[PDB]
Structure 1
Amino acid sequence: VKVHFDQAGKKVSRRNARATRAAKIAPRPLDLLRPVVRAPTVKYNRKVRAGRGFTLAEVKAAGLTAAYARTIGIAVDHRRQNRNQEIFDANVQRLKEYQSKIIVFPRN
């Protein structure tokens, strides 16, 4: 029999871990940009949700490479295919907005 007395403690620990990540990862938003996804199981197909990472085709259409995209905070998933023009266009637009909003400091 396990009782979740630590629920508040677990939440506090998670918040502290997030704050530590922010301190180490201050400039970046702690999250990788995810694509929009349409679910299977028609009971849920109407719902659109975030995916793991953008497909290689979407990354190519976004004007950047997967290797470079990862270093800028874009999740890349080579397992997902593309079979919907609307979803592909939405992902491309999201990637373009991300590229137009990101600021990258010089390596010098």
Structure 2
Amino acid sequence: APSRNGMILKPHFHKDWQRRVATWFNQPARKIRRRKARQARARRIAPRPAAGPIRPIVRCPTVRYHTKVRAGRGFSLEELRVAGIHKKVARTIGISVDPRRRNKSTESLQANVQRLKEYRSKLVLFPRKPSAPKKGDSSAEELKLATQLTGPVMPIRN
């Protein structure tokens, strides 16, 4: 029954909410398990980046957010072919690809192409056979200097 001045409320507690209550007592255990799995993955892929493939620059859709940039799904086919990497080779050398994304303007296209080319210039390619170097490989001087990098491969800063 209502009393003196107050707020009139609508608690959604008329179903059987107690037969399904999700407690979070295993939150620290889940965090520990996640980070142990993360470390296991990071050391099963020995010299490769921990965060995975490189990802392109993206504008946020709506008017509320269209002034910020973030990381996308993959590099589009148009910018990928402008940069000159092959569709089946990009993700085997460490470049994310998505065939669904368009390219409406040219500045974003060119920025993504610059990012892709700079990454290609930066990466170090080990020989497929350790004692048999090939044309596109990297040399021993940087083979002895290769190592993992932590966090995003190239942080996207606006």
| 1:32 aligned partner | 53
Instruction: State which of 94, 98, 104 in structure 2 corresponds to 1:83.
Output: 104
Q: In the aligned structure 1, how far is the partner of 2:55 from the partner of 2:105?
A: 17
Q: Which amino acid aligns with 1:21?
A: R
| 1:57 aligned partner | 78
What does 1:37-48 align with in structure 2 at a 5 Å threshold?
37-48=58-69
Between the aligned residues of both structures, percent identity stands at 56
Instruction: State which of 25, 31, 38 in structure 2 corresponds to 1:11.
Output: 31
Cα displacement string for residues 77-106 of structure 1 (whole angstroms, at most 9, x for unaligned residues): 100000121111111111011101110101
TM-score (norm 2): 0.66
TM-score (norm 1): 0.94
Unaligned runs of 5+ in 2: 1-20, 130-158
| 1:72 aligned partner | 93
Unaligned runs of 5+ in 1: none
Q: In the aligned structure 1, how far is the partner of 2:59 from the partner of 2:67?
A: 7
Q: Which has the higher helix share?
A: 1
Cα displacement string for residues 11-44 of structure 1 (whole angstroms, at most 9, x for unaligned residues): 1111111111011102111311111111211111
CA RMSD of aligned residues (A): 1.0
Runs of 4+ in 1 over 3 A off after TM superposition: none
| 1:2 aligned partner | 22
- After TM superposition, give the deviation of residue 69 of structure 1 in Å: 0.6
